[PDB]
Ligand binder design. Structure first.
Ligand code: HEM
Ligand SMILES: Cc1cc2nc3c(=O)[nH]c(=O)nc-3n(C[C@H](O)[C@H](O)[C@H](O)COP(=O)(O)O)c2cc1C
Ligand code: FES
Length: 765
């Protein structure tokens, strides 16, 4: 028989050599788990492992599919200890009378979701903004102790400690009470996910029992100051609001559950990223140049080298997973580390590419119902760790010929030590001391696609009209800029905000972009900043050309009407048409000829074809005359203040439907007024959850309330950064970016202002 020849799975099927040689505790999976299962991604995506007791799942679609089906794959076993707790160690636990409830990571439905939704808000990026000064304080309090040595183990002296303290601060525990809770804070990787000796088991049960009853007093102490900062005081108020949802046992569990979910995973992530970066030192020095790429950098590290090598689910019914039959009761080892390295979803994957537009898809934080709530707390934490160490010690390198040891376990991965040298005298810090007052705002919660950007340099500022600059933006990389058609714009960070400005430069010049910003007399801050505090030699983050003002090139004729600074996109459209060799007519109005940019440019070219109508002299553009009656072929693109765009739309109402195209520089909306608006449900098919949107609530607000990744720049319906695909349902379109045909197809929606017409929509999210 075959049982005389090879091992057999619990389903009676034979087991492969490579599958039976799988060991998560030693050898190839401890050195590099992702590479150690390359053979499984290629030829056997799902197998039974004899060494450990689980079925192993290796490819990214599959382990994402396990995360979403939370009815079929239960997190019951999420922190089940690999080897069982001995009678001795249970007796030690019982002596402190410790009884922890399953707290969000183990909880099945229907208990898990109400507790997650109730306890979610402090984890959102908006709520985390309060804690950003605290982590910057703690990150530096540590680094300046070893700053002058030129030699440190980052792990023990910096990265093992800091995530523990901020977790205590995130939880809301008094600083008086913190130093002991840390004394009782220990590593759990080998005791939960490894093969510990009986002595190890008890030493954990002793430290965990000590911590359980001390945290019991701490909860009683803060029990009567509920209205203060922290997750636990936030938890107390929901108890009075929902006494059955949130129980005295639960927040006592929430005390330990909180900082064991937060300490080692973040420390290991920090250590991995620093080891991973100091291995490719060119990309290290890139981060040292500008810290603008830190946010996506830490995302590529989390994909490439996460703190979670694998995770676990309990199969609840007989299923098949990618052709392999899996029985009810089977335990799954879903290798997040292999998933992050699956060629079917990422491309050139074992490459460490921090500008990767794909990093955000890694499963290091999990996926779906139980996705890590503190992911943005950890994202912020890593980002600041990695800005201070790139700011102060860019001349830091790894001690060569260094061997990195990682504790034998199935799920957690982080070096025992990372040893780094640097030249102490050479710190940029001691000659500055200006770099420290520099603080870069955290950017968390946004997908990697929406945060990729080129940091260009300003090579020249030219005044071409009153209150109008012409900015010349140079790419410092040296590598050529994208091709862009007329009407295209860019999103440039004007200080703490981003604005978009059309491109009026030369397209055939592909070492530069040119924009002509106007000083808005009533300026919410973006236009002022450019005029008031930008000089030559600065560098601005600028996110590649998009275009909502594209021209159909097969039209008979183009007549362009332009008001004020609306001259910028049209003049590039005028240039395309002169190149084509096509009839066009351009009409340019403005308050004053002195304040009308590009008349010089408009005189040297298109001068035979331009007519000017400056207001100050008194010659005005009367659209009624111009568009008195149409012609079949003529199209009209136009851009300027809303008053002329509106009035023009009136004058061109006589014409065929697709005749007029406009680009708005301002937004109309809005008034929310739920009274006129109805709530609905939005379900996220990829994630496998339904988020409710209230009448007073935008779709965008509900997504960030579930801490789903989203980027929003304008939220006035004008910029386009919040677009997301619609699989089902018809949408109440309220943006100004999508063409009336794009709104018809219903394939897409703007997260911040558009809604449902109706009861539900399905989004690819
Ligand atoms: C980079 C460091 C971190 C990694 C790699 C990580 C990974 C995870 C993973 C894989 C899960 C389970 C996912 C699932 O079963 O869908 C998880 C659940 C969780 N994480 Fe983390 N996490 C980190 C930092 C944190 C921090 C700092 C907190 C804040 C205290 C945190 C709070 C949680 C909570 C509360 C859950 C359970 C939520 C639920 O099951 O609804 N995590 N985390
Ligand atoms: C030359 C120029 C081009 C602009 N192009 C666009 C654009 O293509 N899309 C857009 O939404 N806004 C555009 N704007 C408007 C700006 O984004 C912004 O609202 C304006 O300059 C004022 O910023 P502030 O009110 O924050 O000071 C443009 C403004 C200027 C001066
Ligand atoms: S955020 Fe710019 S359109 Fe929604």
């Amino acid at each position: 028989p075959i049982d005389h020849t090879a091992f057999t799975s619990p389903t009676g099927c034979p087991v492969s050599p490579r599958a039976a040689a799988f060991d998560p505790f030693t050898g190839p999976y401890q050195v590099d788990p992702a590479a150690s299962l390359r053979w499984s991604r290629d030829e056997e995506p799902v197998f039974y492992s004899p060494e450990l007791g689980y079925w192993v799942v290796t490819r990214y679609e599959d382990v994402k599919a396990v995360f979403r089906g939370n009815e079929l794959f239960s997190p019951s076993i999420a922190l089940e200890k690999i080897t069982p707790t001995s009678d001795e160690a249970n007796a030690v636990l019982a002596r402190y009378g410790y009884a922890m409830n399953r707290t969000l990571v183990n909880e099945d439905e229907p208990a898990h979701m109400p507790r997650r939704r109730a306890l979610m808000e402090p984890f959102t990026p908006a709520a985390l903004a309060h804690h950003e000064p605290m982590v910057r304080r703690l990150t530096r309090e540590y680094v300046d102790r070893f700053i002058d040595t030129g030699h440190v183990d980052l792990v023990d002296e910096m990265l093992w400690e800091v995530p523990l303290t901020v977790a205590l601060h995130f939880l809301g525990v008094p600083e008086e009470d913190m130093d002991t809770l840390r004394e009782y804070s220990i590593a759990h990787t080998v005791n939960t996910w490894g093969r510990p000796a009986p002595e190890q088991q008890v030493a954990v049960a002793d430290a965990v029992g000590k911590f359980w009853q001390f945290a019991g007093t701490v909860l009683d102490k803060m029990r009567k100051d509920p209205d203060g900062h922290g997750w636990m005081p936030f938890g107390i108020r929901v108890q009075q609001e929902q006494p059955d949802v949130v129980t005295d046992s639960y927040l006592h569990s929430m005390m330990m559950a909180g900082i064991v979910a937060a300490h080692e995973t973040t420390a290991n992530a920090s250590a991995n990223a620093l080891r991973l970066l100091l291995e490719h030192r060119d990309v290290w020095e890139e981060i040292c140049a500008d810290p603008s790429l830190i946010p996506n950098a830490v995302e590529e590290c989390l994909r490439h080298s996460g703190s979670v090598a694998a995770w676990r689910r309990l199969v609840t019914a007989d299923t098949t997973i990618n052709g392999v039959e899996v029985p009810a009761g089977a335990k799954l080892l879903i290798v997040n580390s292999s998933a992050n390295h699956d060629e079917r979803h990422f491309i050139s994957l074992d490459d460490f590419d921090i500008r990767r537009d794909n990093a955000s898809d890694h499963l290091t934080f999990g996926y779906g119902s139980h996705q890590c709530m503190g992911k943005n707390l950890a994202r912020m934490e890593i980002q600041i760790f990695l800005e201070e160490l790139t700011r102060r010690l860019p001349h830091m390198e790894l001690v060569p010929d260094q061997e990195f040891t990682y504790l034998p376990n199935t799920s957690f991965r982080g070096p025992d030590h990372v040893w780094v040298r640097w030249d102490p005298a050479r710190n940029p810090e001691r000659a500055d001391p200006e770099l420290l007052s520099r603080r870069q705002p955290v950017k968390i919660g946004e997908p990697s696609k929406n945060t990729i950007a080129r940091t260009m340099a300003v090579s020249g500022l030219e005044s071409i009209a009153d209150d109008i600059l012409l900015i010349t933006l140079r790419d410092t990389s040296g590598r050529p800029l994208p091709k862009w058609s007329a009407g295209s714009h860019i999103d440039v960070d004007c200080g703490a905000v981003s604005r978009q400005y059309s491109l009026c430069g030369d397209p055939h010049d592909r070492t530069t972009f040119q924009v002509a910003v106007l000083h808005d007399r009533e300026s919410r801050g973006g236009s002022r900043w450019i005029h008031t505090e930008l000089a030559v030699g600065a560098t601005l983050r600028v996110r590649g050309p998009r275009n909502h003002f594209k021209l159909d090139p097969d039209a008979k004729r183009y007549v362009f009407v332009a008001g004020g600074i609306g001259i910028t996109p049209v003049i590039a459209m005028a240039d395309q048409v002169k190149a084509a060799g096509g009839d066009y007519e351009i009409h340019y109005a403005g308050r004053s000829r002195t304040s009308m940019a590009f008349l010089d440019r408009l005189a040297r070219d298109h001068g035979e074809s331009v007519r000017v109508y400056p207001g100050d002299e008194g010659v005005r553009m009367d659209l009624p005359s111009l568009f008195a009656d149409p012609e079949d072929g003529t199209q009209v693109y136009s851009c300027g203040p809303e008053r002329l765009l509106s009035a023009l739309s009136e004058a061109t109402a006589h014409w065929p439907d697709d005749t007029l195209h406009v680009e708005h520089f301002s937004s109309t909306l809005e008034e929310l007024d739920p009274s006129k608006e109805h709530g609905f449900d939005v379900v996220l098919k990829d994630s496998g959850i339904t988020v409710p949107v209230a009448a007073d609530q935008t779709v965008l607000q509900a997504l960030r309330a579930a801490n789903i990744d989203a980027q929003s720049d304008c939220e006035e319906g004008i910029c386009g950064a919040c677009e997301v695909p619609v699989l089902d349902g018809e949408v109440d379109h309220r943006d100004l970016v999508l063409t009336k045909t794009e709104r018809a197809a219903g394939k897409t929606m703007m997260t911040c202002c558009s809604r449902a017409c109706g009861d539900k929509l399905t989004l690819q999210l």
